[PDB]
Ligand binder design. Structure first.
Ligand SMILES: [Mg+2]
Ligand SMILES: [Mg+2]
Ligand SMILES: [Zn+2]
Ligand SMILES: [Zn+2]
Ligand SMILES: [Zn+2]
Ligand SMILES: [Zn+2]
Lengths: 162, 162
DNA sequence: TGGCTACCTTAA
DNA sequence: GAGAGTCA
DNA sequence: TGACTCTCTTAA
DNA sequence: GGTAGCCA
């Protein structure tokens, strides 16, 4: 349907509108006991959010553009990867926040990857903690840590071995 | 209701019946390019599963014991931790497989931790890969890796910075 | 018990 | 992390 | 376009 | 990953 040139047109209008979202400076742990700085372009909390942006859910938004009399809509974060495929190895791709900030829409803090790879980053040590992600992390997962496990493995008798 | 003495009674009857489940020897990656061995006590695929065991779902089971004329039922993997609390920092605890094998019921391959901690193990490098979990992992997550991310962060214009 | 049933909560 | 709809 | 509304997906 | 019902 849409032409490559028309797509690009969209992406570009996107980047502009997004470009004017307020910029927020965030200190994030990169790992290795090192701290870094990031800048998220966060969509407003309430309307108006932007030109062509709407909220379909609490932390959900959609971008909509009319072209040759037909309305087109996509996920507020799916645009930068409109030219990229929509499945890798049979796995549907989505937009993953590398900053772990939903409201943020900076494409530099985003990526196209499966739902599993996306979640994984949640527990990643960080680029400085030892991240091994093909597309490196810009920050250490917000869940990385030793955890708060209550009870470990244990048997009362001796009916088992490891 | 149930007394501590009564509880232990359960756990023991559990460990007993569980102890006779067929034992399966599995080779698993511990990380660091190292391989180890584990022994899972897998519940049968179909009935009969065991003494007081039933299937409430494809990969779901329940243990049931009658005591002083009142039936008691729990999750086939929750028993080992019946004396332990049911929430840490306000987070409900569950049973996490350290071997990542549902059918397995070996308490040496189990632990009581939040739902998030449980999931995190999924991407853990392993005890030999660099695991930092308070309650060490028995194997490296089955999802650990660089991933198959299709597109990385990128902007067409120059409206952004990291 | 034995053996099924149907329904539930998650963050992205 | 997604889809679609419906008033204006 | 503006601004609201709805249901879905996933394996733990 | 987890709670409960029904019928022999
Ligand atoms: Mg993410
Ligand atoms: Mg698990
Ligand atoms: Zn950001
Ligand atoms: Zn990473
Ligand atoms: Zn096991
Ligand atoms: Zn671990």
């Amino acid at each position: 349907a849409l032409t490559n040139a028309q797509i690009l047109a969209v992406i570009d209008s996107w980047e502009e509108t997004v470009g004017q979202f307020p910029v927020i400076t965030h200190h994030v742990p990169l790992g290795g006991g090192l701290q870094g700085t990031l800048h998220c372009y966060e969509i407003p909390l309430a309307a108006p959010y932007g030109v062509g942006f709407a909220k379909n859910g609490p932390t959900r938004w959609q971008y909509k553009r009319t072209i040759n009399q037909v309305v087109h809509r996509w996920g507020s974060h799916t645009v930068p990867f409109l030219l990229e495929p929509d499945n890798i190895n049979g796995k549907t791709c989505t937009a993953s926040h590398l900053c772990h900030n939903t409201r943020c829409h900076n494409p530099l803090h985003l990526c196209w990857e499966s739902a599993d790879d996306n979640k994984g980053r949640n527990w990643c040590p960080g680029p400085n903690g030892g991240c091994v992600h093909a597309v490196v992390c810009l920050r250490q997962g917000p869940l990385y840590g030793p955890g708060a496990t209550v009870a470990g493995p244990q048997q009362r008798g001796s009916h088992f071995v490891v």
